[PDB]
Amino acid sequence: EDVRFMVSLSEYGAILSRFFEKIDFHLPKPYYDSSIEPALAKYIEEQPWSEDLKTRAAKYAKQAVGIASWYPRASFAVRFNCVVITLLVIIYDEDYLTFGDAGTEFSLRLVRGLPQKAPFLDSLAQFLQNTDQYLGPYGSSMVIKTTLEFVEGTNVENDFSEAVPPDALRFPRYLRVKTGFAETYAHAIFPNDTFPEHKYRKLYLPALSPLCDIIDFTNDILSFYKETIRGTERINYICNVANTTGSSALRCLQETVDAVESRVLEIHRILAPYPDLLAHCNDYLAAYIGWHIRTTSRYFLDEVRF
Amino acid sequence: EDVRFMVSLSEYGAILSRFFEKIDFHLPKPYYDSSIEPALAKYIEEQPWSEDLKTRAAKYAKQAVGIASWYPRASFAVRFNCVVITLLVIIYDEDYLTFGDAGTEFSLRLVRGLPQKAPFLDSLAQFLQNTDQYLGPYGSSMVIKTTLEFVEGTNVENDFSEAVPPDALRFPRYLRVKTGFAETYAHAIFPNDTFPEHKYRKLYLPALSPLCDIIDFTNDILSFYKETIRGTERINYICNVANTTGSSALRCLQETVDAVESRVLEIHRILAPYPDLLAHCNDYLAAYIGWHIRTTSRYFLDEVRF
Amino acid sequence: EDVRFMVSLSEYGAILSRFFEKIDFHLPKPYYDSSIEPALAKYIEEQPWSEDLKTRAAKYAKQAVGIASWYPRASFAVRFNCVVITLLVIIYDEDYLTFGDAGTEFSLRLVRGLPQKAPFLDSLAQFLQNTDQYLGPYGSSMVIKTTLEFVEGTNVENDFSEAVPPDALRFPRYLRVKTGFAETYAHAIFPNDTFPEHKYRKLYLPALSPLCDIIDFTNDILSFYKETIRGTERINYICNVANTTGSSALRCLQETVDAVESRVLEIHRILAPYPDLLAHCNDYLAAYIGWHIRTTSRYFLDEVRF
Amino acid sequence: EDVRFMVSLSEYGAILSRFFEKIDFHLPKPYYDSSIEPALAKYIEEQPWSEDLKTRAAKYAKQAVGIASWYPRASFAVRFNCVVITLLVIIYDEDYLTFGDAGTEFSLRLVRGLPQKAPFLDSLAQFLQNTDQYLGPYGSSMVIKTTLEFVEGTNVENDFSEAVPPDALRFPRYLRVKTGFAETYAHAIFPNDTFPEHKYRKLYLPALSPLCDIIDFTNDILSFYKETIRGTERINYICNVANTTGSSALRCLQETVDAVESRVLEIHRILAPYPDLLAHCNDYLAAYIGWHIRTTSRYFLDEVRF
Ligand SMILES: [Mg+2]
Ligand SMILES: [Mg+2]
Ligand SMILES: [Mg+2]
Ligand SMILES: [Mg+2]
Ligand SMILES: [Mg+2]
Ligand SMILES: [Mg+2]
Ligand SMILES: [Mg+2]
Ligand SMILES: [Mg+2]
Ligand SMILES: [Mg+2]
Ligand SMILES: [Mg+2]
Ligand SMILES: [Mg+2]
Ligand SMILES: [Mg+2]
Incomplete structure (x- = not known):
């Protein structure tokens, strides 16, 4: 028990309320694409996974299918590929320990062109081998490099528990880059069929970093309840910042809220001359937050007033 | 011509003088290891490169061999591998255009385990496959994911000349992460044979992010002369910051000097309980800066008074 | 009633426990000085006060004599003067209403050299006129200007009750400067005999603002029980912060605890090259807390477990 | 020479431009009152000052008469008294050394009811004795206690030169409170004849503190040129903040502009239900900035383009 990490249910609901007013967020109408869930089921049936892993995936696939709503104007290939990688990332985020050390050999085996040590990781390598179906070079x-960071970040996150973040540093943002997986989702905001890199990358690339900050930090704000209030996670971004600035988790929550609003503003500026790019950005962000609110099985936000 | 980007020899010389005094830099005594240059020449002989590539590589090898001085306490495996990858990185930094679009296929061919479209990129892929000789998983x-960024950053850097950077963003730091290659050199500061990851990684990892800031920004300070005063490069970190904050390049240089100083302080705070880890950092930074000064064929700092 | 201001006895005791080991507070041995009690008794006898006021002053003098323990290594003149002004400040804090509007005339009659409208305020003017016995110019x-603030802050404090601090401002800290009387006690930490101003003022002045924050806030922390849990005061600093930030009084208590710890660290850094000055601060803070705990007749902290 | 304090003329002009557009500053129409200057001249004739001091005063009186414009709605008693105290404060700010140690004895002689050691300080004592012509109790x-702070802050300011503010953080604001004289001007924004304290003090007092920040910080921003770029003052707020946080004066100026905008918003929120009180604040701030711009003999801002 440390008060530093304690945020009351009323305090958190207030933070969320303030956040949504600041960015003028409104909950979109429910998004439905009836092809997504059957296609994801077919994908799972096709993997050379144990029956136990497939049974687990059913619980995680119900959460992954909503990721298609993040890209409503994108092609099926974009939306379905993002849902597939979301299923894989969720499985590893929760169950990385069940694969033993297979996750630690992933990067060297990948660049050596070796079979992986776990069939789940073969599925992930194959996803990496085929991103050219919806992205440019x-x-x-970036999807490959971000995946390597996420796998290693997931494997080492908890090494810093038991209070092993040093008190004076910039480590929390570094580690959050590694855990967040943001560039993979950010690049699909600007798909290569609609926005071929050769013509558009120069226009949208300057918005990529503030977009990644939004992706990482918005999840930190919206999942603080399931991670730290309701849960036992004390090595997420918010708690790492609290431990390295001395501040309360409540203040770091509010600081993160302000940083997101600042990033939202700067993306509006960067992409103001190009309303097609900016419209994909706006759709992503509203659905991203709405997915966090509606996926109560993962984030439990129906236990909060905001 | 624009006044914002011009920096007199006298102004640049003074910035370097106050930078060196502020971080208490002294030129290390020269480092000599008689095995490095023959080993690198043997490496170049063994690559199935064209005779023209081997002739250029002989030139860059004379600049590359000095990187062994950055890790004087480390094994030969550390020092030589860092020299080899430095040779390859200088080749690509200088000559990326001569490989055509082979660099843009590098990441997908890498993870598909296929031959590269240029033998130089095969040599790069083989280096990524063998970092386990001196690093942990x-x-x-991180070496792999950094190399993927460095190739793509070098390939797209100049898309942002001709006044492509929009005037309001986080983009310069984003692009310098990609172009800088910092994590590969930082991880060699803490080799796996001396500092097995299982025991030491949790102790030095909080220091990695400011170290990369130091590596990237210190090159930005010390190579500004050859890039922008002596040369025509206006898409580097300094000029990108100037174009997105409205400041002169002189001001952006001074801010970057201040940032490096702050990072130097915070790494000293982080690693004070671990003097072996701190010693390796101190060896690196003195030699890192000294090499920039001494390699006049690349940075021309003997034309500056400091 | 409103939950926003409710703090339970176990909640408050836990906050106090959290505060004390955060600053490494250990209760000092009882401080005894045989000459303080009789000297204060003679001062009360000599004042041309009514018998009713002298009877009141005898009650408050029992609480006031303990202030000499705040300056254990100081001259008798420092300890006794601090005790006398403490007696006067307690009389006004408790009984400002019994003087009618005499206190509102205090500052203009003072600077006009005029008789005050109440003999009690003549004694207060007389104290302000003789601070050169223990302080520099x-x-x-600062004792004069702080007294002027304290008289007026006490007079207008309760104008802000029944809810009329507007809910978005920095007014709480402003009003607390007025009501707290902190600079008078802080300057006696560095008395002019031991630390003559011409030599020492430039050394200890940078620590005065964080000292005043510690003095003010620490009373806010430790007197919250008698004021707001045990009593009806809702216009103190903690309640004012709660009413302008929308936070619970409980949260505001914790924020103020973190603030005091931050000031303690700041003063340890500032006065590190002058450990004699720091020693006087450490003696002050320990006895200041101890006096709050021991003076149960004012703060009732023997009703709390910590 | 120290780059820490160096701001170029282009950099400073850009800061002022950003500052003015951020608070929507427009130069008010010139304010003229034919009675102000003759009354101030008469006041100066009436003073028992040496002919030298009276001659010196002519230079400062021409600057002081502009202070009536800060209170365009207020009575003559407000505008004229503010001009008089401005004359005395400007004389002491520039010429405190010419009065020897008379300033150090000011506060004790004042509260002892004694004649002051210099005729100039008798005039200052008399002003403090008669503020009831336009202020409540x-x-x-507040005018008395602020005057004591200003006299002492002016006397000891330069003791912190030769680089002796240490590197911790609350001291610059502490010293600026002392030197800024802000509360005397802020109280006249809400004068007792227009806004009798009995009815309005509870309404405007919550805005006093952000107002005082605006008055102190706006001078710091608009007088940095005469003090530090053109002048030799390195003990003002901006330089003191730069020495305690490590930042450049350029960074500290931007931070201060941001704090002023924040205070302006907060005051608009506080006084929104009372547009008459808000109107007096808007008139004050516009004419306060305008007087800095127009008083070129003191601030030299006609040498800056903004
Ligand atoms: Mg995770
Ligand atoms: Mg997770
Ligand atoms: Mg999360
Ligand atoms: Mg280069
Ligand atoms: Mg490069
Ligand atoms: Mg460079
Ligand atoms: Mg009180
Ligand atoms: Mg009280
Ligand atoms: Mg109290
Ligand atoms: Mg001054
Ligand atoms: Mg001045
Ligand atoms: Mg000034």
């Missing part, structure tokens, strides 16, 4: 490289 | 992952 | 000016 | 106390 810059984005494919 | 986290460090190997 | 800067300290004497 | 809280305002009168």
Whole structure:
């Protein structure tokens, strides 16, 4: 028990309320694409996964299918590929320990062109091998490099528990880059069929970093309840910042809220001359937050007033 | 011509003088290891490169061999591998245009385990496959993902000349992460044979992010002369910051000097309980700066008074 | 009733426990000085006060004599003067209403050299006129100006009740400067005999603002029980912060605890090259807390477990 | 020479431009009152000052008469008294050394009812004795205590030169409170003849503190050129903040502009239900900035383009 990490249910609901007023967020109408869930089921049936892993995936696939709502104007290939990678990332985020050390050999086996040590990781390598179905060469490289960071970040996150963040540093943002997986989702905001890199990458690339900040930090704000209030996670971004600035988690929550609103403003500026790019950005962000609110099985936000 | 980007020899010389005094930099005594240059020449002989590539590589090898001085306490495996990857990185930094679009296929061919479209990129892929000789699995992952960024950053850097950077963003730091290659050199500061990741990674990882800031920004300060005063490069970190904050390049240089100083302080705070880790950092930074000064064929700092 | 201002006995005791080991507070041995009690008794006898006021002053003098323990290594003149002004400040804090509007005339009659409208305020003017017995000119000016603030802050404090601090401002800290009387006690930490101003004022002045924050806030922390849990005061600093930030009084208590710890660290850094000055601060803070705990007749902290 | 304090003329003009557009500053129409200057001249004739001091005063009186414009709605008693105290404060700000140690004895002689050691300080004592012509009792106390702070802050400011503010953080604001004289001007924004304290003090007092920040910080921003770029003052607020946080004066100026905008918003929120009180604040701030711009003999801002 440390008061530093304690945020009351009323305090958190207030933070969320303030957040949504600041960015003028309104809950979109429910998004439905009836092809997504059957296609994801077919994907799972096709993997050379144990029956136990497939049974687990059913619980995680119900959450992954809503990721298609993040890209409502994108092609099916974009939306379905993002849902597939979301299923994979969710499985590893929750169950990385069940794969033993297979996750630690992933990067070397990948660049050696070796079979992976776990069939789940073969599925992930194959996803990496085929991102050219919806992204250009810059984005494919970024999806690969971000995946390697996420796998290692997931494996080492908890090494910093038991209070092993040092008190004076910039480590929380570094680690959050590694855990967040943001560039993979950010690049699909600007798909290569609609926005071929050769013509558009120069226009949208300057907005990529503030977009990634929004992706990482908005999840930190919206999942603080399931991670730290309701849960036992004390090595997420918010708690890492609290431990390295001395501040309460409540203040770091409010600081993160303000940083997101600042990033939202700057993306509006950057993409103001190009309303097609900016319209994909706006659709992503509203659905991203709405997915966090509606996926109560993962984030439990129906236990909060905001 | 524009006044914002011009920096007199006298102004640049003074910035370097106050930078060196502020971080208490002294030129280390020269480092000599008689095995490095023959080993690198043997490496170049063994690559199935064209005779023209081997002739250029002989030139860059004379600049590359000095990187062994950055890790004087480390094994030969650390020092030589860092020299090899430095040779390859200088080749690509200088000559990326001569490989055509082979660099843009590098990441997908890498993870598909296929031959590269240029033998130079095969040599790069083989280096990524073998970092386990001196690094642990986290460090190997980070060398791979950094190399993927460096190739793509070098390929797209100049898309942003001709006044492509919009005037309001986080983009310069984003792009310098990609172009800088910092994590590969930072991870060698803490080699796996001396500092097995299982025991030491949790102790030095909080220091990695400010170290990369130091590596990237210190090159930005010390290579500004050859890039922008002596040369025509206006898409580097300094000029990108100037174009997105409204400041002169002189001001952006001074701010970057201040940032490096702040990072130097915070790494000293982080690593004070671990003097072996701090010693490796101190060896690196003195030699890192000294190499920039001494390699006049690349940075021309003997034309500056400081 | 409103939940926003409710703090339970176990909640408050836990906050106090959290405060004390955060600053490494250990209760000092009882401080005894045989000459303080009789000297204060003679001062009360000599004042041309009514018998009713002298009877009141005898009650408050039992609480006031403990202030000499705040300056254990100071001259008798420092300890006794601090005790006398403490007696006067307690009389006004408790009984300002019994003087009618005499206190509102205090400052203009003072600077006009005129008789005050109540003998009690003549004694207060007389104290302000003799601070050169233990302070230099800067300290004497700060005791005068702080007394003027304290009289007026006490007079207008309760104008802000029944809810009329508007809910978005920095007014709480402003009003607390007025009501707290902190600079008078802070300047006696550095008395002019031991630390003459011409040499020492430039050394200890940078620590005065964080000292005043510690003095003010620490009373806010430790007197919250008698004021708001045990009593009816809802216009103190903690309640004012709660009413202008929308936070619970409980949260505002914790924020103020974190603030005091931050000031303690700041003063330890500032006065590190002057450990004699720091020693006087450490003696002050320990006895200041101890006096709050021991003076149960004013703060009732023997009704709390911590 | 120290780059820490160096701001170029282009950089400073851009800060002022950003500052003015951020608070929507427009230069008010010139304010003229034919009675102000003759009355101030008469006041100066009546003073028992040496002919030298009276001659010196002519230079400062021409600057002081502009202060009536800060209170365009207020009575003559407000505008004229503010001009008089401005004359005395400007004389002491520039010429405090010419009075020897008379300023150090000011506060004790004042509260002892003694004649002051210099005729100039008798005039200052008399002003403090007669503020009831336009202020109520809280305002009168605040003008007295602010005057004592200003006299002492001017006397000891330069003791912190030769680089002796240490590197911790609350000291610059502490010293600026002392030197700024802000409360005396802020109280006249809500004068007792227009806004009798009995009815309005509870309404405007919550805006006093952000007002005082605006008065102190706006001078710091608009007088940085005469003090530090053109001048030799390195103990003002901006330089003191730069020495305690490590930042450049350029960064500290931007931070201060941001704080002023924040205070302006907060005051608009506080006084929104009372547009008459808000109107007096808007008139004050516009004419306060305008007087800085127009008083070129003191601030030299006609040498800056903004
Ligand atoms: Mg995770
Ligand atoms: Mg997670
Ligand atoms: Mg999360
Ligand atoms: Mg280069
Ligand atoms: Mg490069
Ligand atoms: Mg460079
Ligand atoms: Mg009180
Ligand atoms: Mg009280
Ligand atoms: Mg109290
Ligand atoms: Mg001044
Ligand atoms: Mg001045
Ligand atoms: Mg000034």
